[PDB]
């Protein structure tokens, strides 16, 4: 089954940044034909810590940029919504509607995403036990979603720290396809980078259906997640490595 | 003065709200020293199961709360779940409540501040005490003047919440602090026996108010049945925390 | 029932330090007659982080100093043991044998303490759930202990941090007398001081049978726990406050 | 070379030790690339219950391990619980194992180093990865030269352990790192189904060896029955981690 790689800059800082990253992703999709790539970027960071941090350029602008990426490269698209009303407009361009970790339990947002007919990817809340994502998936099916993903992005471990409990991959696999978020799982809420690659290797060795990675031409200048966004030039090598580890580990993946 | 926010978890019916409102009114008359605020949610927006009780709607709920504020002259507070609900709710609500999961949603906070009403944010289970500083700033930026931060527990492994009381003095540096006595002991996903003990700790440590869900018959509650306090037990607990506070206040640190 | 106050310098830095603190504790015992005071100090810090930190002056020296305190002031004594063989010699002076948090599950150390006929106080491990102290008490009874205490000293909460779950007081009270350790519960493993008094108020409001506090004439010069040891001149006020909070909260203590 | 430490949890009888030793010997002959070490405890010093199996004593245990080292020529490792046991154990044990709870007991570490043998410390459930640096220093001070740190999980709420794999590269800065595949998934106080998945993660991330308890019939084990790996399953798992390591080693960071 085709492995999923969801990647892109954290925030749609501009339509130019989007096309620049989109070009590299299109190139990788041509090389890694056994992979299904999905371009990701948020039209809005609705929950930055500080009121002074970069949020975005609006839904309208974001959707237009994302659509430009899709038209120009033939890339599938995914972006996250924050309130029910955003589902409809976003569904016009997004192949996969993403649900933020903090909102994984908001019934109406989930129902709004499901009725669009698009695929839905829910980031598992940092407060949520893996066995409790069962009802999240149940809500989505109830709302009409036929293609569902659950994304592992770490769990609250003391203050300002997240730990990844890899037991969650096979548990959530019982009711949905599982994606490992390599970027936000090492982030210190409220170092980090050096742990991205090692945990990604662990994820594919344990077994998942896809990986999610934020990447930017020059992370040091990103308007959000600068410290954890992967340098764009490193994406190819990371992908090649996980496909290699995936292949050799695959014969041992347990049947759920 | 000391704040006591109480009421049934969900607006099961304006009838139930009036029965609880009557008692809160009575206690209100008995403890003139305490500022009571009637609380109840018009919608349980994040029940684990799709097949659970959510409520009767915003309109029916606002109308029911209006009836309590009118019949008993009590202050009101209910929680909002999306930005568009702030204004209609602000018609009745004296204090707008922000759910713990949504404590970081900038637009929800700004829409709350914009109504001019008081705003009470439940500290997320994922949030460090010192990180509530930015939450308060967003509300100030948005024009909020009366701001409350409510302690409701912190994620401790799976399906468990622990109350780190160090948070009370930390959050107090930038806002009035309320202690949520009922959601702080519930396991997410012994509960009741621990509500009063931890309530006593909160007042011994020092807080500006206490938040408690109460129901005539918690057993039959449509939400949080396991943790809602029997209405008949409310007076005794209020008297107990006022006596403890009277003695302990002598030692509350300045900060 | 007489409230227990266990206090003293963390480590027996010298016999002079011991007599100096012992004098203040004797004075307080005369004032607070409704309190049972127990003088505490370790003849050895058997698990400092660094091999270079202060450990002590030996079992022999320590026991002799502790005995001097007992003879000179009529104060009850408590100190901790680290290996089974230490129980016998230590029992000659200690009225209460303390079991370190990390060793709360070592069957032989527990059995060695119990057969001395002395009272035993076990610090609850930072890894231990409160309902699991039941078997610790069972082991002690099996070994002959008739007077047992369980001491709350925090729980592992992420890295380098402890949280106090006050629900543990009424749970452990089901099988033993409970003591709240005001000093080590705010310590950051591997600020702190400002939280000592507030958490002590919480402990007595919830309800316990005693409090444990480390105190030193000049904390800033202590050879161990300098940051969290309470200034000796502050002890009287802390004790007075907890007796006041205890009295007003007492009528509400639940029956276990 | 890669380390594989395996054996039954408790020395239930030198007989059982010989049956397991035979298989480890065979695998030893099959995977010449791997350094096998036979492991078994002569005493379960911290069972929750006083009415549980502890063992048959240090003398009986050392004798039984001696029989394995003699009959099969395999290296040995057992854990000590108090300082006085280091020397007698060092007669047979090639590697002295320090229990996770006692990883901070200076005298136990020093007595272990003094025997001149190799020392493997299980990282406490309460210990941060970076704080293992001082543990290693105590052993060096004590004369230890071959030092191992073993990852066995971290306290995550009550009765639960989580494995933070970030610890593998952190501890590796000052010692060889071993991953304990069996105690890392046990709940203190799904287990088995998670042993192999996490073992795969450990080798994908990078470690110098793996630790696994195995028993001919775990169901009948006198200790850790729920988590000991069936002896017949050991070969397949070893082959699996060698293949994963062969491919993943290309990407292990230098550090």
Give CA–CA dist C235/C228, Å, rounded: 13
Give CA–CA dist A183/A196, Å, rounded: 7
Token readout for B200 is 């006593």
* Interchain CB contact of C158 with A (< 8 Å): yes
Q: Are A120 and A96 in contact (CB under 8 A)?
A: yes
Give CA–CA dist C213/C234, Å, rounded: 11
Give CA–CA dist B122/B39, Å, rounded: 14
Q: Are A110 and A143 in contact (CB under 8 A)?
A: yes
* Interchain CB contact of D239 with A (< 8 Å): no
Q: Are strands A155-156 and A162-163 parallel, antiparallel or unpaired?
A: antiparallel
Token readout for C53 is 């930190």
Q: Is C125 close to D158, i.e. CB distance below 8 A?
A: no
Q: Are B203 and B215 in contact (CB under 8 A)?
A: no
Residue D197 has its nearest CB partner, among A166, A186, A199, at A166
- A97-127 exposure pattern, b = at least 16 Cβ within 10 A, e = fewer: bbbbbbbbbbbbbbbbbbebebbbbbbbbbb
Q: How far apart are the first and last CA of chain B?
A: 18
Taking a contact as any Cβ pair under 8 Å apart, which residues of chain D between 116 and 155 contact chain A? 154
Pick from A112, D209, D137: which is nearest to C51 by CA? Answer: D137
Residue A218, number of CB atoms within 10 A of its CB: 12
Pick from B59, B74, B57: which is nearest to B18 by CA? Answer: B74
Cα→Cα distances A53→B121, C136, C253, Å:
20, 52, 48
Q: Are strands D2-7 and D34-39 parallel, antiparallel or unpaired?
A: parallel
Pick from B227, B216, B218, B219: which is nearest to B180 by CA? Answer: B227
Give CA–CA dist A68/A39, Å, rounded: 12
Q: Are D119 and D144 in contact (CB under 8 A)?
A: yes
The conformation of residue A209, written as its DSSP 8-state character, comes to: S
Pick from A2, A5, A1, A9: which is nearest to A210 by CA? Answer: A5
Token readout for B231 is 């209405």
Chain C positions touching B240 (Cβ under 8 A) are 252
Q: How far apart are the first and last CA of chain C?
A: 15
Output the domain CATH number for residue A212: 3.20.20.70
Give the rounded distance of the alpha carbon of C60 from its chain centre. Answer: 21
Q: Are B95 and B117 in contact (CB under 8 A)?
A: yes
Pick from A71, A7, A65: which is nearest to A36 by CA? Answer: A7
Burial (Cβ within 10 Å: 0-12, 13-18, ≥19) of residue D190: exposed
Q: Are D121 and D94 in contact (CB under 8 A)?
A: no
Give CA–CA dist C248/A79, Å, rounded: 56
Q: Which residues contact B247 (CB under 8 A, 6 or more apart)?
A: C244, C245, C247, C248
Pick from B165, B178, B28, B161: which is nearest to B98 by CA? Answer: B178
Q: What are phi and psi of D145, to 5 degrees?
A: -125, -35
Give CA–CA dist A8/A20, Å, rounded: 10
Q: Are D92 and D62 in contact (CB under 8 A)?
A: yes
Q: Are B4 and B36 in contact (CB under 8 A)?
A: yes
Taking a contact as any Cβ pair under 8 Å apart, which residues of chain C between 167 and 196 contact chain D? 189-190
Chain C residue with minimum CA distance to A158: C158
Give CA–CA dist C180/C130, Å, rounded: 13
User: Tokens 């370790």 — which residue?
Assistant: C42
Chain A positions touching B129 (Cβ under 8 A) are 159
* Interchain CB contact of B158 with C (< 8 Å): no
Q: How far apart are the first and last CA of chain D?
A: 18
Give CA–CA dist B60/A88, Å, rounded: 27
Q: Is D158 close to B158, i.e. CB distance below 8 A?
A: no
Give CA–CA dist D105/D99, Å, rounded: 10
Chain D positions touching A186 (Cβ under 8 A) are 166
Q: Is D155 close to C48, i.e. CB distance below 8 A?
A: no
> For chain A, what is the total number of helices (H) and then of strands (E)?
8, 11
Q: Are D49 and C136 in contact (CB under 8 A)?
A: no
Token readout for B220 is 């039959």
3-class DSSP state of C107: helix
Q: Are D75 and D37 in contact (CB under 8 A)?
A: yes
Q: What are phi and psi of B187, to 5 degrees?
A: -90, 120
Angle subtended by helix axes D14-30 and D234-248, to nearest 10:
40
- Residue from C126, C157, C158 to probe the interface with A (highest A Cβ count within 10 Å): C158
Burial (Cβ within 10 Å: 0-12, 13-18, ≥19) of residue B216: middle
3-class DSSP state of A211: strand
Residue D248 has its nearest CB partner, among A155, A245, A254, at A245
The C-alpha of B163 sits at a distance from chain A's nearest C-alpha, in angstroms, of: 12
Burial (Cβ within 10 Å: 0-12, 13-18, ≥19) of residue D35: middle
Q: Is A139 close to B104, i.e. CB distance below 8 A?
A: no
The set of chains that have 3 or more CB pairs under 8 A with A is B, C, D
- β strands within B10-115, DSSP E: 34-39, 75-79, 95-98
Q: Which residues contact A251 (CB under 8 A, 6 or more apart)?
A: none
Give CA–CA dist C135/C118, Å, rounded: 19
Q: What are phi and psi of B91, to 5 degrees?
A: -65, -40
SS3 per residue for C212-227: EEEEECCHHHCCCCCC
Give CA–CA dist A57/C46, Å, rounded: 59
- β strands within A94-217, DSSP E: 96-99, 119-123, 148-152, 155-156, 162-163, 177-181, 210-216
SS3 per residue for chain D: CEEEEEECCECCCHHHHHHHHHHHHHHHHHCCCEEEEEECECECCCCCCCCCCCECCHHHHHHHHHHHHHHHCCEEEEECCCHHHHHHHHCCCCEEEECHHHCCCHHHHHHHHHCCCEEEEECCCCCCHHHHHHHHHHHHHCCCCCEEEEECCEECCCCCEECCCCHHHHHCCCCEEEEECCCCCCCCCCHHHHHHHHHHHHHHHCCCEEEEEEECCHHHCCCCCCCCEEHHHHHHHHHHHHHHHHHHHHHCCCC
3-class DSSP state of A196: helix
Cα→Cα distances D1→B94, B248, C169, Å:
70, 64, 50
Give CA–CA dist C153/C144, Å, rounded: 25
Q: How far apart are the first and last CA of chain A?
A: 15
Q: Which DSSP string corresponds to C146-170?
A: SSEEEEE--EE-SSS-EE--TTHHH
Q: Are strands C230-231 and D2-7 parallel, antiparallel or unpaired?
A: unpaired
Which structural domain, as residue segments, surrounds residue B37?
1-255
Cα→Cα distances B159→A155, B254, C108, D161, Å:
12, 35, 35, 14
Q: Are D108 and D135 in contact (CB under 8 A)?
A: no
Burial (Cβ within 10 Å: 0-12, 13-18, ≥19) of residue C249: buried
Q: Is D158 close to B157, i.e. CB distance below 8 A?
A: yes
User: Tokens 């978020």 — which residue?
Assistant: A181
SS3 per residue for C41-94: CECCCCCCCCCCCCCCCCHHHHHHHHHHHHHHHCCEEEEECCCHHHHHHHHCCC
The conformation of residue C97, written as its DSSP 8-state character, comes to: E
Give the rounded distance of the alpha carbon of C7 from its chain centre. Answer: 7
Pick from A3, A37, A39: which is nearest to A207 by CA? Answer: A3
Give CA–CA dist D5/D210, Å, rounded: 6
Angle subtended by helix axes D195-205 and D234-248, to nearest 10:
30
Chain B residue with minimum CA distance to A140: B50
Cα→Cα distances A153→A49, A103, A125, A183, B17, Å:
18, 13, 8, 8, 40
Q: Are A217 and A17 in contact (CB under 8 A)?
A: yes
**Total tally of structural domains belonging to chain B:** 1
User: Tokens 């096309």 — which residue?
Assistant: A19
Pick from C187, C211, C218, C186: which is nearest to C21 by CA? Answer: C218
User: Tokens 């276990």 — which residue?
Assistant: C256
Q: Are strands D161-162 and D154-155 parallel, antiparallel or unpaired?
A: antiparallel
Chain B positions touching C228 (Cβ under 8 A) are none
The set of chains that have 3 or more CB pairs under 8 A with C is A, B, D
User: Tokens 């996980």 — which residue?
Assistant: A242
In angstroms, what is the C-alpha Rg of chain A?
A: 17
Token readout for C181 is 């350790």
Give CA–CA dist D155/C247, Å, rounded: 36
- B31-68 exposure pattern, b = at least 16 Cβ within 10 A, e = fewer: beebebbbbbbbbbbbbbebeeebbbebeebbebbebb
Q: Are D234 and D23 in contact (CB under 8 A)?
A: yes
Give CA–CA dist D62/D46, Å, rounded: 19
Nominal resolution in Å? Answer: 1.9
Chain B residue with minimum CA distance to A83: B82
Give CA–CA dist B223/D144, Å, rounded: 60
Give CA–CA dist B99/C77, Å, rounded: 51
CA dihedral sign of residues D110, D112, D113, D116? positive
Q: Are B211 and B2 in contact (CB under 8 A)?
A: no
Give CA–CA dist B202/B249, Å, rounded: 12
Q: What are phi and psi of B98, to 5 degrees?
A: -105, 115
- Residue from A248, A250, A251 to probe the interface with D (highest D Cβ count within 10 Å): A248
Give CA–CA dist C125/C153, Å, rounded: 8
For residue A80, the surrounding DSSP H or E stretch is strand A76-80
Give CA–CA dist A46/B101, Å, rounded: 13
CA dihedral sign of residues D65, D53, D189, C185? negative
Give CA–CA dist A193/A214, Å, rounded: 12
Pick from C78, C83, C138, C76: which is nearest to C108 by CA? Answer: C83
Q: Are D41 and D72 in contact (CB under 8 A)?
A: no
* Interchain CB contact of C244 with B (< 8 Å): yes
Q: Are C44 and C55 in contact (CB under 8 A)?
A: yes
Give CA–CA dist D197/A254, Å, rounded: 8
């Amino acid at each position: 089954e085709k492995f999923l790689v969801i990647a892109g800059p954290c925030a749609i800082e501009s339509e130019e940044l989007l096309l620049k990253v989109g070009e590299e992703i299109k190139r990788l999709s041509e090389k890694f034909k056994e992979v299904e790539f999905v371009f990701k970027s948020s039209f809005d960071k609705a929950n930055r810590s500080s009121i002074h941090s970069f949020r975005g350029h609006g839904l309208e602008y974001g959707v237009k940029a994302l659509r430009k990426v899709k038209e120009e490269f033939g890339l599938k698209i995914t972006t996250d919504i924050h309130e029910s009303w955003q589902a409809e407009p976003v569904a016009e361009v997004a192949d996969i509607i993403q649900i933020p970790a903090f909102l994984c339990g908001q019934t109406d947002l989930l129902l709004a995403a499901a009725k669009t007919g698009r695929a839905v990817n829910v980031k598992k809340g940092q407060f949520l036990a893996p066995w409790d994502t069962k009802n999240v998936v149940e809500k989505l099916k109830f709302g009409g979603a036929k293609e569902i993903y659950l994304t592992e992005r770490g769990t609250t471990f003391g203050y300002n720290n997240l730990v990844v409990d890899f037991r969650s991959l096979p548990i959530m696999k019982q009711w949905a396809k599982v994606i490992y978020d390599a970027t936000h799982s090492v982030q210190l809420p409220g170092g980090m980078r050096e742990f991205i690659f090692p945990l990604i290797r662990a994820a594919v060795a344990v077994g998942c259906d896809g990986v999610f990675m934020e990447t930017h031409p020059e992370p040091e200048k990103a308007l959000s997640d600068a410290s954890t966004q992967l340098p764009l030039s490193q994406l190819e090598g990371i992908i090649e490595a996980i496909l290699e580890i995936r292949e050799v580990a695959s014969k041992y993946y347990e049947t759920i």
